[PDB]
Homo-oligomer: A and B are copies of this chain.
Amino acid sequence: KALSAVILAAGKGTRMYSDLPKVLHTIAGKPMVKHVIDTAHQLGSENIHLIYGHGGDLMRTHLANEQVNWVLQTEQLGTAHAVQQAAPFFKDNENIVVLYGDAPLITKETLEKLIEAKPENGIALLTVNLDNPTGYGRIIRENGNVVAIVEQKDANAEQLNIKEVNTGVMVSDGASFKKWLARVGNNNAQGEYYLTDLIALANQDNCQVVAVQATDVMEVEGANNRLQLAALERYFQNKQASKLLLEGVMIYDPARFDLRGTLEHGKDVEIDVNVIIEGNVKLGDRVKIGTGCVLKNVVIGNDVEIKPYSVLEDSIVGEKAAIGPFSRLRPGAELAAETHVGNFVEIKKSTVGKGSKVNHLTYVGDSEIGSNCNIGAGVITCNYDGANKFKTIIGDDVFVGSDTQLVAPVKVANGATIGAGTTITRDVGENELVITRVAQRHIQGWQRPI
């Protein structure tokens, strides 16, 4: 059969103590609900029906590009009534999986096992065994077969002893859902339609209710507060780190590694402790990343070593280049092959050509630097106090002496030499040597405090 999904994402998440709605809280840099959407799609869902409510505007701005059918929940009438709002879109002959935007770790493999165990015209539900089943809905079995679910507040002494609980995740065919949902009543103190009633309605229709137990508890675990979110984050990071390790990436300590995005890697990549990878990061062969580096949306060529406490964003680094320690690459930094970037160096929106070195205490912004240049310590690109930010153009084989200020817009042609302590405001021609003429007083026999 075909498949479509329903994700409940309307909940408030009061225990989060947040102006953000529950499902928008992130795991590895992306909202909980987004993980669930991706799994639903990877599962093969034709449609994804996102049921939303609380913090609606924030949902729509934060998930604008998500390939989903937006189903707004006006009146809060319980989960069965919410899914019923998505029900008119169900095709009779397709399976419908119900998921929760606050249980982000649910896997493709487990859901595939659940679908395949669904009997024709029946229900398949996910259940899980807990040492302490307190608070959750108990799974009721008559002679092996599943007949009902009983919540804590209704459970008798013996029922309270059942260690198998309801995860809320279930699969059934479209027509069955439409059929059973309509027959759910709200004769209760809270006056709302509970999704769990569908188990009894299937049994009363003499349809099979197969439970599939999940081996991994965390997979069906929901984050109701930030302690629980942190537990989920750590599990998810460990899962990501294990994969990379078995693929051949050396992570010196997976427990001190963070991937918040996607990583593309070559072979013999080494990643030291306390490194954070964000956005889209591509690493070529034999790249070495030292402790405390942060890489966000970067492309690193082969044989690049990144020394400790370097921070890179939206940057490109050519093969055999050397970065760090304490280097800052800001958006738009392009380093060609064999370039050197050293301590306390900031590079913004600039191209640095092959073999050029920028080794200490320097700021380069809005600049184009050619090949084999020597950019001295204390060199700074700046602007006049004016309207917009102009560019600095440096050619090949240029020597820029220590503590020189390059005032944009300015051009320094091939082979030029610029002496230490210079203020460059006029264009420098090819093979031109610029020296600052200093004026100094020398005072003899000046004695310092003894």
Contacts and interface: CB of A to CB of B under 8 A. Distances in A.
Contact of A253 (B19, B233, B249): B233
A204 to B, nearest CB: 42
Interface in A245-274: 245-256, 258, 267-268, 272-274
Nearest to A441: B435
A50 B137 CA distance: 52
Interface in A362-403: 362-363, 374, 376-378, 380, 382, 385, 387, 397, 399, 401-403
Interface centre among A233, A344, A448 (most CB of B within 10 A): A448
B230 A252 contact: yes
Contact of A227 (B233, B245, B444): B245
A380 B399 contact: no
A29 to B, nearest CB: 10
A316 B185 CA distance: 58
Nearest to A272: B276
Contacts of A433: 441-444, 446
Contacts of A380: 360-361, 376-378, 402-403, 420
A18 interface: yes
Nearest to A18: B268
A291 interface: yes
B417 A405 contact: no
A26 to B, nearest CB: 9
B248 A17 contact: yes
A296 to B, nearest CB: 11
A325 B346 CA distance: 11
Contacts of A374: 385
A346 to B, nearest CB: 5
A270 to B, nearest CB: 10
A294 B249 CA distance: 23
A282 interface: no
B294 A291 contact: yes
Contact of A346 (B256, B343, B397): B343
Interface residues of A, number: 91
Interface string A143-185: 0000000000000000000000000000000000000000000
A385 B417 contact: yes
B325 A415 contact: no
A83 interface: no
A431 interface: yes
A64 interface: no
A401 B440 CA distance: 14
A135 interface: no
A253 B276 contact: no
A360 B444 CA distance: 29
A397 B254 CA distance: 49
Contact of A226 (B251, B294, B403, B434): B251
Given A294-B291, A380-B403, A420 B423 contact: yes
Nearest to A330: B343
Contact of A443 (B25, B242, B267, B435): B435
A395 to B, nearest CB: 12
Nearest to A325: B311
A445 interface: yes
A308 interface: yes
A420 B405 contact: yes
Given A382-B402, A382-B420, A437-B441, A17 B276 contact: no
A9 B425 CA distance: 64
Contacts of A362: 361
Contacts of A361: 344, 346, 361-363, 380
Interface of A: 16-20, 25, 225-227, 229-230, 233-234, 242, 245-256, 258, 267-268, 272-274, 276, 291-292, 294, 308-309, 311, 325-326, 328, 342-344, 346, 360-363, 374, 376-378, 380, 382, 385, 387, 397, 399, 401-403, 405, 407, 415, 417, 420-423, 429, 431-449
Given A225-B246, A233-B252, 4 more contacts: A344-B346, A346-B361, A360-B363, A376-B380
Please list the 7 inter-chain residue pairs (A to B) with the smallest Cβ-Cβ separation, ordered nearest first: A17-B248, A433-B446, A433-B443, A227-B245, A382-B402, A437-B439, A385-B399
